[PDB]
Amino acid sequence: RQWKVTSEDLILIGNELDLACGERIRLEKVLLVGADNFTLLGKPLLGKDLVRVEATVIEKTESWPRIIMRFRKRKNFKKKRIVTTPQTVLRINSIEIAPCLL
Amino acid sequence: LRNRVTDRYFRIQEVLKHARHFRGRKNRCYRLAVRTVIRAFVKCTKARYLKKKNMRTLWINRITAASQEHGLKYPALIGNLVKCQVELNRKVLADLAIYEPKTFKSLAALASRRRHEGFAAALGDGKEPEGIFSRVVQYH
Amino acid sequence: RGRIPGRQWIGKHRRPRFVSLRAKQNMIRRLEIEAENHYWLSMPYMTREQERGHAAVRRREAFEAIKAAATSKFPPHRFIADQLDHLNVTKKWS
Amino acid sequence: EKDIIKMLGLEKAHTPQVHKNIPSVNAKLKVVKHLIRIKPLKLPQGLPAEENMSNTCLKSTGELVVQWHLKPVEQ
Amino acid sequence: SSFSRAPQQWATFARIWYLLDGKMQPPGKLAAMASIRLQGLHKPVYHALSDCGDHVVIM
Amino acid sequence: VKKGFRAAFRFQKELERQRLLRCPPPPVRRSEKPNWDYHAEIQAFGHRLQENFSLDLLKTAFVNSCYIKSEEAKRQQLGIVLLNLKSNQELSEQGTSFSQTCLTQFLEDEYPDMPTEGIKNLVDFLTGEEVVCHVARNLAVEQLTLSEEFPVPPAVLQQTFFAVIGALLQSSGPERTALFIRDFLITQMTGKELFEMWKIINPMGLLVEELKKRNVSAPESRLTRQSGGTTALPLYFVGLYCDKKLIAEGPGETVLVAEEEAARVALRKLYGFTENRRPWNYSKPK
Amino acid sequence: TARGTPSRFLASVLHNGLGRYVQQLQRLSFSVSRDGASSRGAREFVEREVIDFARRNPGVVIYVNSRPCCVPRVVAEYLNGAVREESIHCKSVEEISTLVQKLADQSGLDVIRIRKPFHTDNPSIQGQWHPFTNKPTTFRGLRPREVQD
Amino acid sequence: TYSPLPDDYNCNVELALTSDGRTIVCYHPSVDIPYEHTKPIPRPDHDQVLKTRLEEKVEHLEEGPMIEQLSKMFFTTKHRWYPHGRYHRCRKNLNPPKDR
Amino acid sequence: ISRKWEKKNKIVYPPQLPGEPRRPAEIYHCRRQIKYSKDKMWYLAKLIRGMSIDQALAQLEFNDKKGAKIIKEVLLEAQDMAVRDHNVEFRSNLYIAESTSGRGQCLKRIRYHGRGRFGIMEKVYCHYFVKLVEGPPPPPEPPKTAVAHAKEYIQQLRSRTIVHTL
Amino acid sequence: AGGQWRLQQGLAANPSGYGPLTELPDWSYADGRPAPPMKG
RNA sequence: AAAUCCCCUUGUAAAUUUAACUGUUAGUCCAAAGAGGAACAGCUCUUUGGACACUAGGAAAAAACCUUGUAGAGAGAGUA
RNA sequence: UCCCAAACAUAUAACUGAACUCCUCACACCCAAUUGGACCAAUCUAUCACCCUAUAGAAGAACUAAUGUUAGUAUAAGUA
Ligand SMILES: [Mg+2]
Ligand SMILES: [Mg+2]
Ligand SMILES: [Mg+2]
Ligand SMILES: [Mg+2]
Ligand SMILES: [Mg+2]
Ligand SMILES: [Mg+2]
Ligand SMILES: [Mg+2]
Secondary structure: OOOOOOOOEEEEEOOOOOOOOOOEEEEOOOOEEEOOOEEEEEOOOOOOOOEEEEEEEEEEEEOOOEEEEEEEOOOOEEEEEEEOOEEEEEEEEEEEEOOOOO | OOOOOOOHHHHHHHHHHHHOOOOOHHHOOHHHHHHHHHHHHHHHHHHHHHHHHHHHHHHHHHHHHHHHHOOOOHHHHHHHHHHOOOOOOHHHHHHHHHHOHHHHHHHHHHHHHHHHHHHHHHHOOOOOOOOOOOOOOOEO | OOOOOOOOOOOOOOOOOOOOHHHHHHHHHHHHHHHHHHHHOOOOOOOHHHHOOOOHHHHHHHHHHHHHHHHOOOOOOOOOHHHHHHHHHHOOOO | OHHHHHHOOOOOOOOOOOOOOOHHHHHHHHHOOOOOOOOOOEOOOOOOOOOOOOOOEEOOOOEEEOOOOOOEOOO | OOOOHHHHHHHHOOOOEEEEOOOOOOHHHHHHHHHHHHHOOOOOOOOOOOOOOOEEEEO | OOOOOHHHHHHHHHHHHHHHHHOOOOOOOOOOOOOOOHHHHHHHHHHHOOOOOOHHHHHHHOEOHHHHHHHHHHHHHHOOOOOOOOOOHHHHHHHHHHHHHHHHHHHHHHOOOOOHHHHHHHHHHHOOHHHHHHHHHHOOHHHHOEOOOOOOOHHHHHHHHHHHHHHHHHHOOHHHHHHHHHHHOHHHHOOOOHHHHOOOOOHHHHHHHHHHHOOOOOOEEEEEEEEOOOOOOOEEEEEEEEOOEEEEEEEEOOHHHHHHHHHHHHHHHHHOOOOOOOOOOOOOOO | OOOOOOEEOOOOOOOOOOOOOOOOEEEEEEEEOOOOHHHHHHHHHHHHOHHHHHHHOOOOEEEEEEOOOOOOEEEEEEOOOOEEEEEOOOOOHHHHHHHHHHHHHOOOOOOOEEOOOEEEOOOOOOOOOOOOOOOOOOHHHOOOOOOOO | OOOOOOOOOOEOOEEEEOOOOOEEEEEOOEOOOOHHHOEEOOOOOOOOOOOOOOOOOOOOOOHHHHHHHHHHHHOOOOHHHOOOOHHHHHHOOOOOOOOO | OOOHHHHOOOOOOOOOOOOOOOOOOEEEEEEEEEOOOHHHHHHHHHHOOOOEHHHHHHHHHOOOOHHHHHHHHHHHHHHHHHHHHOOOOOOOOEEEEEEEEEEOOOEEEEEEOHHHOEEEEEEOOEEEEEEEEEOOOOOOOOOOOHHHHHHHHHHHHHOOOOOOOO | OOHHHHHHHOOOOOOOOOOHHHHOOOEEEOOOOEOOOOOO
């Protein structure tokens, strides 16, 4: 998934990352970094030494119940299933860049 | 041994609770409510496919609106960015247009510059060198 | 006005249908794909005599595994601990 | 034609599969030539060895490069 | 843009008057570029549930 | 009559739930509810906050003067020994004095051009009644608060919150408390505008004096953009020009409100509280 | 369905994790019966795991009450006031441990439909789009088909 | 001489490629409205012995004309100005969720 | 059966401190098993709903419907015990809060028809409920003015956000 | 969109097929410890 | 006449036998070859194949035409 | 019974488009009749349990539908 993130925001990943809550990680796949006056683009990804972004796990919970119902008329076909998808919430802490354009 | 059902009140309450916000007698009569609750459940399950389709269509409309403001067409902007190795999907492109007008304008400039580069390359017979922004980064 | 007798797609008088530009474009590009397939199928690496029996050993060994798997069906072993583990259902604190 | 597709292991569409260029395989392929795409195999680095068996990658142009580094070409 | 919340929302969802000169023009082409303006389809923030339409004046 | 017990038992629980919802009981303190242990709860309080609190300081941090008076009244009625409990009045003053100084220091470095009056208001807002009460409630401060009535009054709750800050200051020190207040008080102004935290009247009135201080000519207002002037839904973009140079642009439904918004925009840029400013640095210092 | 269930926006408690992470679980209460097959999984859980779980989470208070009961229960309280009650009626030990661990990571907010998988107080840095964002300004800003002086 | 887009309304866009060609640099400083492209603010808009007090100019109007006046002043239709029944008035959520 | 309306006159509130204002007096009264249709009696109950006690009596006195005199006596005796037993100072300082009718117990009789057929007729009975609150009747809600429509429309336009985005 | 151009350049028609955008690990530990490999 | 039967290699994983019984064989439409006193269609009836009585997308609405199947969540993408 | 989307010859062929395929994760979890399994509400008994449960044995063991039976109340209707 592609996310337009900034500092101090929450995004929801519909999966478990096998990480303890409160741990801070780094996201190495950055496609675009922009500012008020300048913007830098990757082809298709920026170098690791150019931009660094880090996030902290703050929540690991299940999803609300979801209904999966299938019905066919006049065939006695009726099935119901309830699923909950594990999800994780990450808070983007800081976005850092370095003057490595040259 | 005579056995009679003693929890039928709870067996019908688990269905009536899903129809509490309906209109007419079908929100309280179990015979009517069970038939419409099933339809509501079926519609909800298949609406997830429609949500993914409709959201993409909304993004395409917004991207087209922003591009037309810059004198560009949606097919021209989408294809040229791909040729520039800029893999941005429809959502972020719509997000950039709404919230980052200056960044989106730069992307529109990049597409138009790439579009003119391809026209010049097609205009030539191949003897001319490649365009500045037409170079592709090779990965091994 | 504009009734079509019988059904739309079957019957003596159907609804007339015409091809479109992209309908053709899809057909040619499929025809070109097989033209590639036709060419690449015209250069066998070996002949029938050379290929005869060059894979008989692997085919035979694969079938023996199939035979062994089919003939190995048997009821599983029954242990005493699992039968005795049901005694734990009444376990309680002192 | 359904059985022929079953034999060649072509159940899931757009899933490449390698086959021997022999008359017996060619005979089966000719039946379903209208449902499949046939391309030759290229080995610019040759047949892979045991050391690099996990480093192979079949590129879309039809060759199996044995050195997959996921790194931009310095050239 | 350091705008306050109420003025920022007001400006974003404002209504813009457009003028069209139909002299020696095909009605369909005039109607074509007027429908987008009336529906607000030219706005990047457009949505059907949002009353984002604009005013169109044709002479 | 149908023989059986489970169905009737399930129905009784459902009716009691309806009876509970029909007239919910008045709220009661968590301590009076079962499964409570003041020693155990206050011990985990420090570990939950990842701090090494002092048991004596923390225990007396939640003691309020009203609670002491109520206990003295209760024992007087019973006619019964003397208590040696100390109220958190001195601890609250230490926490309040340090928090005001620490907040003022933190904001001055982040916004050097912020005027002193603007600095005071933001500290007043952060140390406001609702901000500490919202933080204290979400930090389970009110649960451990020893008061005379429930729920704890906001003035008492605010005093208790500043008390534990002083207790941490005595137990740990200024450097550890500075990180604590930054993590729980600075974070309360993330997505709020400068004037959403500092209410001001006549933004243009003090904008002129600010440009007077900066030795700049008076701003003049001009209409950059206009739409629907004669209708009921107008839009006016009023910009301010000094020496025929734009400094700010402000929208509004009328000319007057657009001019005030333009003044607010200029003040935000002058004071460095723009939405484009770099986010606060929460990283641990090197 | 969503139309029949209240929803909320994605959010946290007091910007948890911005400066430091605070464990949202605050209290745990366990009801265990000394005798009864329904509490066997709960009983063995506290014989071997409740001690290790307590050391792992020092900010969470755990209460273990042993009284006669037909359905063992666990009650979790969070700092926001939310209360969650889960039954331990006839489950194993490896699955109560997962169940107990799940409540620790939860923030205590309502588990309902989330309108947006993302939330930010500053969606734009260069300014939100407005109709005049991409509109050039003419000399003196004359309106169309109007004259001056 | 060349410019992909006319840089006169939103921002001047400059495009550059890095030395290795693996990154695209876009510098887009914002533009400002010239002083000559603005209008001045429209500031301009007897023997009296009695104080001129605020008089009641609110005249009562019937449901018909009042809706018609609302429709023409807001350029909307007449349908939205009619009241709704109790069934719809109660299904409305008085406490909606709030974001941003 | 249920007779909760009668017991509503037996609830007693604790004495009020001088700080809080005066709690208006309320009286619950009802007449059971009236030989009348609940649908027909509903019109009379709705008519006198929200009006003063003495104005309601004047309206009911000159009404031609049979149920009018029944309610008139019910209102009269409700006013009597209000002053006598419910600490009501002025007997004319009362207004009707809620007036409604409920279905009573009814009998089933046979109505003969031609060709040997029959139809089950019903002898309808109904109850009438009324609550009186001390004090002048509240003013009716004024019609919503055009300016009220104007601000409401503005509020809807100002409350819209950009949907399906950040 | 853009699939034919990708095939000519020697890449996958689907940008998510193979390459650094999908094959490379998405995250790693803050201190620099590499993340465990993903199941996909 | 299109084609069938038989059938080593090869591709593949099924096939035969034994034990135990239920249920279906009042079918429809399309492509093709036919038959119904030497009937261009229509009506009825055989043979081969496909679809339908199983999902979705597209032909306006669409059981039988084209695309496509093995099952969930996603506010990703490439295509038919 | 009343035509029937509205339109448009001129800005460089891409773009749009599925439950097909790919991506994060998880996978027993979209066919009639029929067949094979995995579970289970409620009730009685044996033993447990003791704010309502557990292991076994048993059976008058589960109703959106038979112009189904009995009882209650609506619709037509405050109508004939
Ligand atoms: Mg027809
Ligand atoms: Mg007779
Ligand atoms: Mg699939
Ligand atoms: Mg699967
Ligand atoms: Mg039965
Ligand atoms: Mg029946
Ligand atoms: Mg009638």
